[PDB]
């Protein structure tokens, strides 16, 4: 078997790029996932994965 | 504007500085007894942290690395490889 | 009788009112009892009999309808029975489902509605959760978890068993529950002879709506006492200590009645009650203030503390004094689905602890977020259940009505899809982009999901499920779990690698209270074992069911060895259906003898070709710093590992993101024995940076010479 790459390749600024070599991507693309546009009946998904907010600890809501 | 004509008077001959120092120091007798309690267990919470730190390293001496353990775990692997082939070979030369 | 006389899809509420008034019970043949009967009369007093007549008419005329109505109106449990007369099962050999968001709430449920129905658990009403199938062939209704009903979809997505099939709680916006209204949607564009019906509490009727392409929507009325909300005037860099003022000038102003906190962690609910503690002692020593009761309900509490939460309020001191307070800081637990007698005020800083899996780095993490307005809205319901309350939030109007989202983040957002991926696989899913899912997740993350899948031969490289994806599909564990379970019969330690596997999927049995951190470290020391985390796991599940063996009390000697014992049990009923599905599926089971020494390497080898993606180097001998080889991840070994000396290559069953980066559940392994147990993985060719790359191609060539020279010399 072929060793496939990882989807989420990490740069040197620390974003994670979306390798189109890797399996998932490959898969994906076969499925029929467009660039852009989340996946669905009719794309009404969110198309970037919930990011954490980095409040400080016993901090109230709106500081 | 009050900050600026603090020198001036009121309707009642008073300075407006005068009014505003006589709240500002009303505030502080409200907060002073409070903010001095904060304080004085600040103080003791945070030199009791210290000591518990000189503690917890005074335990560390009292009871006082990888390349150095897989080391030792790879010669006893080879050493027991050896050991296999010798009696495989037949090298029983002891005394 | 009753079901012959009603018509399937055609019964009308008077007929379904009066075959459940009627004194025999249709459902075994039966007689109806006082409780049958009060509990009927209830039902009938309840406003979803009221609206009974027009679910039905909306339930005939529509395939898929959606029902939203405030909580306690009755859609868990009347809703149900009146699908079930209105389907007539006897007439077509399939049963009613209820998904729910908590195996425990389906229990509940479950529980709730055979004592409705007259009839006993598991006979007519059954439950399902995991490793716990309580049910028979005559059963009609059965509530079963999310997860659950995602099994059963992976196992015949047909659903020919299931004839109408509720989803409750969709408000929550589980991963398995997309996942299964996904399924639901896809069965009803199929075939149309199965019934959906979609319950929620939330103003998410249009949404609902637009998801099921225009079903109908019906509303359930009724209201509840009042709630008065104040803001405050700023936001509060210090949300404890806010609360704590806030608590004490309800303690001494406001009038009687139960406080509600929210607060965010346990330590610091822990603290947030001494703190509380010490106040209300300064104040009956100063003040003369009325007595208090402080009940923390963190992430991390017993029975007992739950009991000891709902239990009542104390009393004042004095009679016409300052009555007595329950100060209840809870985290998330009174949020929803909680009913606290007594509870009057409300204390909202704002902020909770939500797990979310960044997949940039995959990274999983418990984190303070800001809350959102349902959750301002469903701890403003929570307060004021049997009078009018107050609720008072740390944060500002304008703050919570822009700052603050909606709705809250899904979990499958929050999470990993690699499950659902295989799930949607071994279902038949070829086309997972191209699937009717109403928010499917991020292209980025579906990628990263199959890739994972791929380096775990979940699916091949064109996405097709193997042998081996079709058997982790079935084996209700993580994927890396079947992977190393599977790969356990080459190293000869499956018994070993079954319970550790067992024991990952299980919650942590290491219990470290505050007031006994040193007995729980000494125990934790005398039950570790040096070679890894797991290693110590093992040894401790070995010196539990060693002391089962022997006779000992279980919970006595969880307690003694500051152990969990229903983490412990939940551990055993695991390895036991692991076993069972091992043995079903023809895998052989066997152990590595005590006196061998390479009984360690084996199962550390077993457990690298589980877990090889999550592996990690140390940077430097000087660094106790550890690199993942998972997008090149710069973190520590956490406190509670029990290996003294770090490893060359630490295999990390947890990753913990916190402000001090730390990886627990590690185990010491090689970087030749991990490139043996993933060639694939951890290819040199297809190596990318760094120099953690080079030292595992270094391992690998000085690995090749020296098979050269055993060839050489053999």
Redo the contacts between chains.
């Keep these: ?10 740069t040197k600024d620390g ?2 790029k ?1 390798n189109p070599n ?7 693309a ?6 852009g546009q ?4 009719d794309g ?20 | 504007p009050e900050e600026e004509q603090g020198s001036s008077r009121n309707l009642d001959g008073r300075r407006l500085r005068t009014v505003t120092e006589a709240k500002a120091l009303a505030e502080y007798l409200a907060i002073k007894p409070e903010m001095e309690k904060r304080e004085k267990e600040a103080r003791r919470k945070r030199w009791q942290e210290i000591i518990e730190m000189t503690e917890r390293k005074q335990e560390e001496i009292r009871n006082g690395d990888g390349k150095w353990v897989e080391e030792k775990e790879v010669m006893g692997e080879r050493t027991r490889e050896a050991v296999m082939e010798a009696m495989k070979a037949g090298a029983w030369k002891d005394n | 009788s009753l079901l012959d006389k009603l018509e399937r899809r055609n019964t009308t509420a008077k007929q379904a009112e009066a075959v459940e008034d009627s004194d025999i019970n249709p459902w075994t043949g039966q007689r109806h009892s006082e409780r049958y009967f009060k509990i009927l009369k209830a039902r009938r007093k309840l406003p979803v009999n009221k609206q009974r007549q027009e679910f039905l008419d909306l339930y005939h005329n529509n395939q898929i309808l959606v029902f939203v109505g405030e909580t306690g109106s009755g859609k868990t449990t009347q809703i149900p029975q009146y699908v079930l007369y209105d389907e007539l099962p006897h007439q077509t050999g399939k049963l009613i489902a209820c998904t729910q968001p908590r195996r425990v709430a389906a229990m509940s449920v479950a529980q709730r509605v055979a004592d409705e129905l007259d009839v006993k658990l598991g006979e007519e009403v059954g439950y399902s959760i995991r490793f716990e199938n309580k049910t028979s062939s005559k059963t009609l209704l059965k509530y079963m978890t999310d997860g659950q009903l995602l099994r059963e979809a992976m196992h015949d997505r047909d659903m020919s068993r299931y004839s109408c099939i509720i989803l409750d709680e969709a408000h929550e916006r589980t991963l398995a529950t997309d996942i299964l209204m996904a399924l639901l949607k896809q069965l009803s564009e199929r075939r149309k002879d199965l019934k959906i019906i979609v319950m929620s509490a939330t103003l998410d009727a249009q949404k609902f709506q637009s998801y099921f392409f225009n079903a109908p929507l019906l509303a359930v009325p009724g209201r509840t006492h009042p709630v008065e909300i104040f803001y405050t005037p700023e936001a509060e860099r210090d949300y404890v200590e806010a609360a704590i003022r806030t608590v004490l000038q309800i303690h001494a102003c406001e009038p009687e009645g139960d406080i509600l906190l929210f607060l965010t962690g346990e330590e610091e609910i822990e603290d947030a009650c001494r703190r509380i503690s010490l106040e209300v002692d300064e104040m009956i020593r100063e003040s003369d203030a009325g007595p208090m009761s402080v009940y923390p309900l963190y992430g991390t509490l017993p029975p007992h503390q739950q009991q000891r939460i709902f239990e009542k309020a104390p009393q004042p001191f004095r009679p016409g004094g300052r009555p007595g307070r329950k100060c209840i800081v809870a985290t998330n637990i009174a949020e929803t689905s909680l009913t606290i007698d007594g509870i009057v005020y409300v204390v909202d800083p704002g902020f909770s602890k939500q797990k979310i899996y960044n997949p940039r780095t995959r990274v999983e993490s418990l984190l303070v977020s800001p809350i959102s307005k349902a959750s301002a809205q469903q701890r403003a319901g929570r307060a004021g259940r049997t009078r009018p309350g107050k609720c008072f939030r740390l944060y500002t109007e304008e703050a919570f009505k822009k700052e603050l989202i909606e709705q809250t983040y899904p979990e499958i957002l929050r999470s990993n899809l690699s499950n659902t991926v295989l799930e949607l696989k071994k279902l038949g899913v070829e086309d997972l982009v191209h699937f009717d899912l109403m928010d499917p997740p991020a292209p980025e993350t579906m990628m990263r999901a199959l890739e994972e899948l791929n380096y775990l031969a979940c699916l091949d490289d064109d996405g097709e499920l193997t042998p081996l994806g079709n058997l982790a599909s079935e084996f209700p564990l993580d994927p890396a779990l079947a992977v190393m379970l599977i790969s356990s019969p080459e190293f000869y330690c499956s018994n070993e690698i079954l319970s550790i596997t067992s024991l990952l999927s299980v919650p942590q049995i290491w219990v470290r209270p505050a007031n006994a951190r040193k007995r729980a470290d000494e125990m934790k020391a005398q039950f570790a074992h040096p070679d890894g985390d797991h290693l110590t796991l093992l040894n401790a599940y070995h010196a539990y069911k060693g002391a089962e063996a022997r006779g000992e009390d279980m919970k006595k000697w969880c307690h003694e060895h500051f152990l969990s014992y229903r983490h412990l049990s939940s551990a055993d009923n695991v390895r036991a259906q692991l076993k069972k599905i091992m043995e079903t599926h023809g895998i052989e089971l066997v152990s590595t003898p005590f006196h061998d020494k390479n009984y360690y390497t084996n199962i550390r080898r077993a457990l690298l070709a589980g877990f090889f993606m999550q592996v990690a180097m140390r940077e430097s001998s000087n660094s106790k710093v550890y690199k993942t080889v998972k997008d090149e991840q710069l973190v520590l070994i956490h406190p509670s590992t029990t290996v003294t000396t770090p490893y060359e290559w630490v295999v990390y069953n947890e990753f913990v993101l916190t402000t001090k980066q730390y990886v627990r559940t590690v185990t010491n392994i090689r970087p030749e024995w991990l490139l043996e147990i993933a060639p694939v993985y951890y290819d040199l060719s297809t190596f990318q940076k760094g120099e953690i790359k080079n030292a595992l191609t270094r391992v690998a060539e000085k690995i090749r010479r020296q098979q050269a020279m055993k060839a050489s010399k053999a």
Excluded: C
Aim: proline share 6%; glycine share 16%.
């Design positions: 078997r072929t060793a496939l790459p990882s989807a989420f390749q990490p974003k994670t979306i890797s399996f998932g991507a490959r898969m994906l076969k499925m029929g996932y467009k660039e989340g996946l669905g009946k009404q998904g969110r198309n970037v994965i919930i990011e954490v907010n980095l409040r400080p600890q016993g901090v109230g809501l709106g500081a």
